[PDB]
Write a protein that binds this ligand. Structure first.
Ligand SMILES: [Mg+2]
Ligand SMILES: [Mg+2]
Ligand SMILES: [Mg+2]
Ligand SMILES: [Mg+2]
Ligand SMILES: [Mg+2]
Ligand SMILES: [Mg+2]
Ligand SMILES: [Zn+2]
Lengths: 60, 127, 202, 82, 96, 154, 114
RNA sequence: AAGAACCUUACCAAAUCUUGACACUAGAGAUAGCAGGUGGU
RNA sequence: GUUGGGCACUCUAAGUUGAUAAACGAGGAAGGUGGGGAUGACGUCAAAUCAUCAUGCCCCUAUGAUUUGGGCUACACACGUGCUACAAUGGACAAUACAAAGGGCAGCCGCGAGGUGCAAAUCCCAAAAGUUGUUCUCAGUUCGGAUUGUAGUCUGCAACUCGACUACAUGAAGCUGGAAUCGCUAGUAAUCGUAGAUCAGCAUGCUACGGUGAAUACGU
């Protein structure tokens, strides 16, 4: 994301509805999980390192 | 003086008690005919008394849960055959030949990513 | 095409590097963890750090640092680890306790071998020679197998390619095999070079 | 539609412009960006140069427009063709 | 009656901690054995690729294992179990 | 399939007429897994048959099926620039399949309002050697005997 | 027979037959036959003269047929006369409720013109 | 794109800023009394 | 089962088992890698991604930054993927059964949308198809609910462009679809509901869950 875009999302908005989420690692605005605050891409990379506790590849 | 058997079919579990009697079946304190929708289901679950030649010899008290009426009716059949093994282990030969001692291992298949269902693929167009 | 060897084995035969539990502060603790891991990577980039483990309990953070050169992390008289612990307590406002664990045989550690190759590539060393030397060293130290790969503009070529070498067995489909894996990047005048190392100890 | 319990929404800055001209005869055009303001009964007789995205277009308010949004009379898309 | 609840992401560390609480209570006084509560499984389905190819996904899970321990007729026990420190991945709720 | 033949699934006899053929008929009637509707149609149709004919419904139904089941069929074949409809003998299990399929398919095309009415009239018709399903069998034999010279192909 | 100026079908039950009046749907027909105490299952050819009179008096209290058509047409005319966004869509023959017109606007537009 | 009314948002118009967003009154508000770039390959 | 009482049965979840010179009936829950998943070799497409991120070179310090409003939702058309239908194996009305998997902290009187105990095996979100009856009677209709008018509810600073839902009214095309073309081998296809992520509000999409539940495979 653009640096101004990341900065603007971190500022307090004039209205509560203007608040939106970005990935806290890379700033991506799309596909951001609430539990981890990571986009789907960063979640995959960090889960591969074993750095997200309890998270592993699922099969059933 | 009763015999117990646990029957499973799909996601249904039946706890089956056999007491001597005239051939009544009660399912969750209801008559089997007021509990199941079809008579073909009733004939399916009375199979163990057929191959064993014990119709009208026991009463069935059933505590069943999970699944639908077909899975429950067939979990009761599995439970009755298992309970009949307790009454007389010599029933095993006739029950096994009829396939009534098998736990039907067929369960709902999981959906797969990319598919519309377990196996159903999306409509394809080479264009 | 080929799955990350670590990610496939995480939670199966490989343990998590983050050992803590949370429910509603999960995101806040996860990003304090990532804040710490980025700080340690930058502050100890010359100290041959293989990996960092983080344990949390009772407003305390226990950080284990597995390092090839533990005397640089601790410092002469414990002074370098006291300085790093003081800076971690400022990034965190929690009570951090740091443990240092020496890893003997740095030539059997995928991360250290990968970063050594990346450092040599930045010094214009032969992308073939660095891979072959690393493989010979690991196998002499009893490695069951090793695989190396350098990808990119090798030697400043205009067309990027991948050159890989191997020795021994590296059974990437065997789930119970503990395969050490790492990727590192060399910053050359021609752009990024990717270094991947697979090591199978046994 | 907006909940009746919340009343009809008008931007406060625009409403003060209308009330400032209340009790006059030489009404002057009110320039506004508030397409989302409901037209109130006291808007009748007034002209509103309403922003359509690139220019303020005049919207003269008659009684039959009361209760509509100001934006409903300043079209934002241009189409005359295929 | 002391009600102790254990939650962990790994079942091996939760059986180790559950046994330790059970021994500690019985080394002090009557404990109802570790009751295994149902595991919570949360699944995350992400797109594997970074830009397209929606039909290729990767699935991840987080499993929360749960244990319940009841201690009856304790007052050394309440301090004995309180003094215990469990592994880092286990969180314990003592409803003493 | 290429590997070989696959085992077939048995069915239970129906509770009323103790007939496996009747159960297979209900499955042909059934749509979208709705078995209760299919059973209701079949048993209502058999009541209509038993009183519009004066006989047992099952006995009429076996007569009707015997008049629909074909003995010879035609198979497509590519023979060096000329497609040849080779006549073959229908195996006993396929005879029952076609008998039940044609009975239901041509009962669905009739003009009676309810399916129980349509099925009962198809059964009564096929038991008198008439109706759409009997005609379809006749046209299959008429296509086969017109090609009995081609029996030498395989 | 003739209720609001329209000859409702004679062979049907009253609840259904009343819906052949412009302005009366299923729910209105039910309430009209509750107000005017007529059973819903009566065929309108079997309605007594008294029952038919009670229906016509309750129906008289509803805006139906040409009075309802005039009101609806006046509303559309007002939207077009003030040149609102909806009034413009009404005159152009396009959907007025924010539906997409790139595809699937055939009801308002008519058959395709390839 | 696993969530376009504002925000997102990049695109357009207008009103504004030039070590820069980041390292009670007036006004539609924003506002007054070396970095950056979702620019190209 | 709302509790006194018990851990019998069920269940929950840790451990432990769980049956082919090669190969080609008994016993057993299961017979031949049992069903499914994860796992995708050397390489090909200079295949996709400089817009997740990073980065060599080209490229200005206005292609950088802020806000309000508009647009991304346009509309003669063409194509792909879906949803709802064309009805009697059905529509409407009434009564009455049977799931699984998940989520939850400031979160889980009005005809109506709606308004005014539980941090979890505890409380909440929360089955339909089905079965039994009554009615409709083959009609573009008691099928269909597109479109449009009016009046509302809720979220949100704000539903004009451009939200969702509700009530009354309106009642379009559509009566099984040319050439051609797609999926599926069994708890599958078909069909019926349920849950989750994203998310103030917005799902006919995606991912996941169970209920009912087939036909056929002679052969290459
Ligand atoms: Mg938002
Ligand atoms: Mg916008
Ligand atoms: Mg290319
Ligand atoms: Mg760039
Ligand atoms: Mg778009
Ligand atoms: Mg209807
Ligand atoms: Zn990210």
């Amino acid at each position: 994301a653009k640096t101004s875009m990341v900065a603007k999302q971190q500022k307090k908005q004039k209205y509560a509805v203007r608040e939106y989420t970005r990935c806290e690692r890379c700033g991506r605005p799309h596909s951001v999980y609430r539990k981890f605050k990571l986009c789907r891409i960063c979640f995959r990379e960090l889960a591969y390192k074993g750095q997200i506790p309890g998270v592993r590849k699922a099969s059933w | 003086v009763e015999y117990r058997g646990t029957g499973r079919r799909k996601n249904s579990v039946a706890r089956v008690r056999l007491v001597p009697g005239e051939g009544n079946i009660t399912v969750n304190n209801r008559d089997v005919r007021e509990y199941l929708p079809f008579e073909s289901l009733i004939l399916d679950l009375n199979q163990p008394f057929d191959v064993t030649e014990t119709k009208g010899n026991y009463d069935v008290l059933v505590n069943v849960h999970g699944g639908g009426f077909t899975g429950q009716a067939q979990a009761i059949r599995h439970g009755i055959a298992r309970a009949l093994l307790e009454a007389d282990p010599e029933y095993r030969g006739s029950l096994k030949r009829a396939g009534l001692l098998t736990r039907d291992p067929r369960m709902k298949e999981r959906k797969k990513p990319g598919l519309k269902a377990a196996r159903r693929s999306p409509q394809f167009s080479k264009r | 095409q080929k799955i990350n060897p670590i990610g496939l084995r995480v939670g199966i035969i490989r343990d998590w590097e983050a050992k803590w539990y949370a429910e509603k502060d999960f995101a806040s603790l996860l990003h304090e963890d990532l804040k710490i891991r980025k700080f340690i990577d930058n502050e100890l980039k010359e100290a041959s750090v293989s990996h960092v483990e983080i344990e949390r309990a009772a407003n305390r953070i226990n950080i284990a640092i597995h390092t090839g050169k533990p005397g640089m992390v601790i410092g002469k008289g414990g002074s370098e680890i006291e300085k790093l612990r003081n800076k971690l307590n400022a990034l965190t406002d929690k009570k951090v306790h740091i443990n240092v664990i020496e890893i003997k045989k740095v030539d059997l550690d995928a991360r250290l071998v990968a970063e050594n190759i990346a450092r040599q590539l930045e010094n214009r060393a032969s992308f073939r020679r660095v891979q072959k030397q690393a493989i010979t060293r690991a196998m002499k130290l009893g490695a069951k197998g090793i695989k190396t790969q350098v990808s990119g503009r090798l030697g400043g070529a205009d067309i990027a390619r991948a050159e890989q070498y191997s020795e021994g067995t590296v059974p990437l489909h065997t789930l119970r095999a503990d395969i050490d894996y790492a990727h590192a990047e060399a910053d050359t005048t021609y752009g990024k070079l990717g270094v991947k190392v697979w090591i199978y100890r046994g | 539609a907006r909940s009746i319990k919340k009343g009809p929404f008008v931007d406060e800055h625009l409403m003060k412009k209308v009330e400032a001209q209340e009790g006059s005869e030489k009404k002057q055009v009110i320039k506004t960006w508030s397409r989302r303001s409901t037209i109130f009964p006291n808007f009748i007789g007034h002209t509103f140069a309403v922003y359509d995205g690139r220019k303020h277009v005049p919207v003269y308010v008659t009684e039959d427009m009361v209760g509509h949004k100001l934006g409903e009379f300043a079209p934002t898309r241009t189409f005359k063709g295929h | 009656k002391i009600r102790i609840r254990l939650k962990a992401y790994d079942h091996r560390v939760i059986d180790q901690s559950a046994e330790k609480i059970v021994e500690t209570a019985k080394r002090s006084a009557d404990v109802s054995g570790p009751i295994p509560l149902p595991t919570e499984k949360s699944v995350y389905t992400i797109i594997r690729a970074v830009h397209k190819y929606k039909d290729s996904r990767e699935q991840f899970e987080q499993r929360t294992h749960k244990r319940l321990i009841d201690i009856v007729n304790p007052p050394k026990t309440v301090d004995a179990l309180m003094g215990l420190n469990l592994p880092s991945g286990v969180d314990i709720e003592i409803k003493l | 399939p290429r590997k070989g033949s696959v085992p077939k699934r048995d069915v239970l006899p129906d509770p009323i007429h103790n007939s496996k053929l009747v159960t297979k008929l209900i499955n042909k009637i059934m749509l979208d897994g709705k078995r209760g509707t299919a059973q209701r149609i079949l048993y209502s149709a058999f009541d209509l048959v038993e009183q519009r004919s004066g006989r047992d419904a099952l006995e009429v139904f076996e007569e009707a099926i015997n008049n629909i089941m074909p003995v010879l069929e035609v198979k497509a074949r590519r023979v060096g620039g000329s497609n040849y409809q080779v006549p073959v003998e229908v195996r006993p299990e396929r005879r029952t399949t076609l008998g039940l399929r044609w009975l239901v398919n041509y009962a669905r095309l009739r003009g009676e309002k309810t399916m129980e009415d349509r099925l009962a009239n198809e059964i009564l018709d096929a038991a008198n050697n008439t109706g759409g399903a009997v005609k379809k069998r006749e046209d299959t034999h008429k296509m086969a005997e017109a090609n009995k010279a081609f029996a030498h192909y395989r | 027979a003739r209720i609001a100026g329209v000859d409702i079908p004679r062979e049907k039950r009253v609840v259904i037959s009343l819906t052949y009046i412009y302005g009366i749907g299923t729910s209105t027909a039910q309430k009209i036959l509750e107000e005017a105490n007529v059973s819903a299952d009566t065929r309108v050819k079997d309605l007594t003269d008294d029952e038919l009179g009670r229906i016509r008096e309750v129906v008289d209290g509803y805006k139906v047929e040409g009075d309802l058509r005039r009101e609806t047409n006046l509303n559309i005319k007002r939207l077009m006369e003030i040149s609102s966004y909806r009034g413009i869509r009404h005159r152009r023959g396009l959907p007025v409720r924010g539906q997409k017109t790139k595809n699937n606007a055939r009801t308002r537009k008519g058959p395709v013109k390839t």
